Amino acid sequence: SRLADFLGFRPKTGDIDVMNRQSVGSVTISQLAKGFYEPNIESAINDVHNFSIKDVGTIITNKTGVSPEGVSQTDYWAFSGTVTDDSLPPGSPITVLVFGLPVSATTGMTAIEFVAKVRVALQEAIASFTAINSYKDHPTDGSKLEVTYLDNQKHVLSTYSTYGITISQEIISESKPGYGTWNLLGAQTVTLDNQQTPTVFYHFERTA
Amino acid sequence: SRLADFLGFRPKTGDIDVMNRQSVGSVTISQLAKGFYEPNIESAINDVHNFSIKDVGTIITNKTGVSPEGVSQTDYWAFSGTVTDDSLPPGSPITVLVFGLPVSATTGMTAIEFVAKVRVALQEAIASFTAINSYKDHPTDGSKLEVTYLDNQKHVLSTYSTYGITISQEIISESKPGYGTWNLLGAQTVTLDNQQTPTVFYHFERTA
Amino acid sequence: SRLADFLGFRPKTGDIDVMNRQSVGSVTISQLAKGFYEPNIESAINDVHNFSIKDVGTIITNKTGVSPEGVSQTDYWAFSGTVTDDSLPPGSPITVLVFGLPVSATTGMTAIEFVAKVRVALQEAIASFTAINSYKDHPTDGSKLEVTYLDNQKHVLSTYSTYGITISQEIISESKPGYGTWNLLGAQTVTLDNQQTPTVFYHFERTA
């Protein structure tokens, strides 16, 4: 169990949206088993989660032909400076945190050299399925890396400096809401009632 | 960041609803960059938010003809009494909190006079886009004000007295679930497969 | 009040999904009235809740014919051992917590005898609309009980032992996302644009 299970949540008065009988956030057996008996955040989030995901086989219709599937954000991670820590002799091994990822560097490294070590940290995050989906080298800049996340949430990271290296984010493509896997079944032309102009609808089915 | 980024969330076992890869609440680069490495509430809420907003161009169909758009609650805030502060002399300036809004009042003011000060606090909340969308004077009662909120959540405010002034809430119009801007495309009369009577469906397209 | 009203939430940058005006989690009059002026968890969950529940009359379409309604999880509560407490005399009445439920027990009881006390626990929980929806006796094993929860969230309980008795969980039927009451209006066979094969769609209307 985590903090959320034990953080109180104030349910809406008269709310019975959960299985036609109780309010979002109502305590569940999961909390009772740990000795908590109040409506809580864990329960509330799980409830809304259950309201938003439609069953496989469900159909979503739109007039754009754009998939309902979510899209992950992709950025450029940029670096500048020289790894510095004057309290240590040149070439001393140190750990530098890059947006939370521990990077093994050495004092004296230029940004170009440092970036090579960031590649290794990204590989490790990817391998443990932690936040990072994939990365690629920048085609014309050795001090930048392209990174794509696992989730499709929006991330705006603050620029900062650590051990002489300035780290910043440059958003390349925005994320897009959505979930699951959807298949374009096709199009259906329909002339709405009492109208003469036809409208083309595109139907998507959730396959996974 | 305040706290949500640093509050643990227990993910659902077997959950891969986020981009067909991970559970709602899985740690993201935003938390890593702040020094938090576990599944959390900030991320969980952002994930469900991503599941609940359909893309512009999406079609919603119903049989009522009622728009999917949300509606904010509207109240009457009522006041009565005289601003009092036995600890201070008549006419002494004081700050009174009206449902959290700071009102500049003076001991000795009548409820009607106080309401005039409340109008100023509402204007300031409106100008800073803080919870209040708009307000209007009660047509025939100088001790009441009509107020509409920015969000479309339900709000039940408790009656209370502060510095001699009793403040209460009278809900005029209920809020309604929903989001975005939707446009009625028209109607579609359809006779389901083995049926005798036609069914009229209304289609709404999200435009913003 | 509850803690959620006072825990900060970091809004999504550029987010105006709430009434086309503000971000999910923006402060509302409910928090202001309690002295909290920042974006928060309570508001955030309430906003997403407002996005995910579609109005009565809304139509959901799928190709499986499976109801969009949610389904609660159902388990088997297993018990083993003998009610013990060497610090007290035999038959001494004690309070045993079963997944948070307080059962009136007495040292010396066998697993079967204990279950009888558990039935009364589930009864008071059910009558109190607390987490438990219903319950029945195991088809065969008298040391087990079938239970169904009010919510449709997934629950994984850890096996534990207290007062000599070992309590365990066995998930029988998995829960399913969903909400409200939906009515299958019927089927609609349509041949999508330029297709030689017809597809059958099932339309469900939210009645409650």
Query: How large is the C-alpha radius of gyration of chain A?
Result: 24
In chain A, residues with a C-beta closer than 8 Å to the C-beta of C2 are: 8-10, 38-39
Contact C30, B100 (CB under 8 A): no
The amino acid occupying position C68 is: P
State whether B20 and A72 contact (CB < 8 Å). Answer: no
Task: Please tell me which residue of chain B has the smallest CA distance to A72.
Answer: B19
Cβ within 8 Å, pair B150-C18? yes
Cβ-contact A43, A28 below 8 angstroms: yes
Consecutive H or E run containing B52: helix B41-52
**A60 close to B206: Cβ distance less than 8 angstroms:** no
- Contact status, residue B103 vs residue B184, Cβ threshold 8 Å: no
- Chains touching C by CB (3 or more pairs below 8 Å): A, B
B140 phi-psi bin (left φ>0, alpha ψ -120 to 50, beta other): alpha
Task: Find, among A205, B145, B34, B41, the residue nearest to C64 by Cα.
Answer: A205
Q: Which residues contact A105 (CB under 8 A, 6 or more apart)?
A: A83, A93, A94, A95, A96, A113, A114, A117, A163
Query: Tokens 């034990």, residue?
Result: A6
Q: Which of A2, A52, A61 sits opposite B9 (nearest CB)?
A: A2
CB contact under 8 A, B28 and A190: no
Say if residues B177 and B85 touch (Cβ distance below 8 Å): no
The CATH architecture to which C70-178 belongs is: Alpha-Beta Complex (3.90)
Q: How far is CA C205 from CA A23, A50, B187, C69, C200, in A?
A: 22, 18, 16, 11, 17
Residues of chain A contacting C150 with CB distance shorter than 8 Å: 18-19, 21-22, 26, 28
Alpha carbon separation from B159 to A9, B80, B133 (Å, rounded): 22, 12, 22
Q: Tokens in use for B52?
A: 């609940």
Q: How far is C63 from chain A (nearest CA, A)?
A: 5
List CB contacts (< 8 A) between A134 and chain B: none
| CA atoms of B105 and C197, how far apart (whole Å) | 75
Q: Which of A172, A119, A111 is nearest to A145 (CA)?
A: A119
How would CATH label the architecture of C53-69+179-208?
Single Sheet (2.20)
C20 contact residues in B (CB cutoff 8 A): 179-181, 208
The CATH H-level superfamily of A1-52 is Baseplate structural protein GP11, N-terminal domain (1.10.286.30)
B200 exposure class (CB count in 10 Å sphere: 0-12, 13-18, 19+): exposed
Q: What is the resolution of this structure in A?
A: 2.0
Give the whole-angstrom CA distance, residue C101 versus residue A29: 9
Q: Report d(CA A39, CA A41) in Å as an integer.
A: 7
Of the candidates A53, A149, A192, the beta carbon closest to that of B17 is on A53
The first and second tokens of residue A15, run together, are: 């709310």
Kind plus residue range of the DSSP H or E element containing A101: strand A101-106
- Which chain A residue is nearest to residue B156, measuring alpha carbons? A13
Quote the tokens at residue A78. 């940029």
Of C37, C50, C187, the CB nearest to B153: C50
Binary contact (B32, A100; C-beta < 8 A): yes
Instruction: Give C107→chain B minimum CA distance, Å.
Output: 36
Among the partner residues A31, A37, A55, nearest to C177 by beta-carbon distance = A55
CA A45 from centre of chain: 17
Residues of C in contact with A183 (CB under 8 A): none
Mutate to test the interface with B, among C1, C29, C30, C155 (most CBs of B within 10 A): C29
User: Domain coordinates of chain C in residue numbers?
Assistant: 1-52, 53-69+179-208, 70-178
Distance between CA atoms of B71 and B52, rounded to whole angstroms?
17
| 3-state secondary structure at position B87 | coil
Nearest to residue C29, comparing CAs of B136, B158, B139?
A: B158
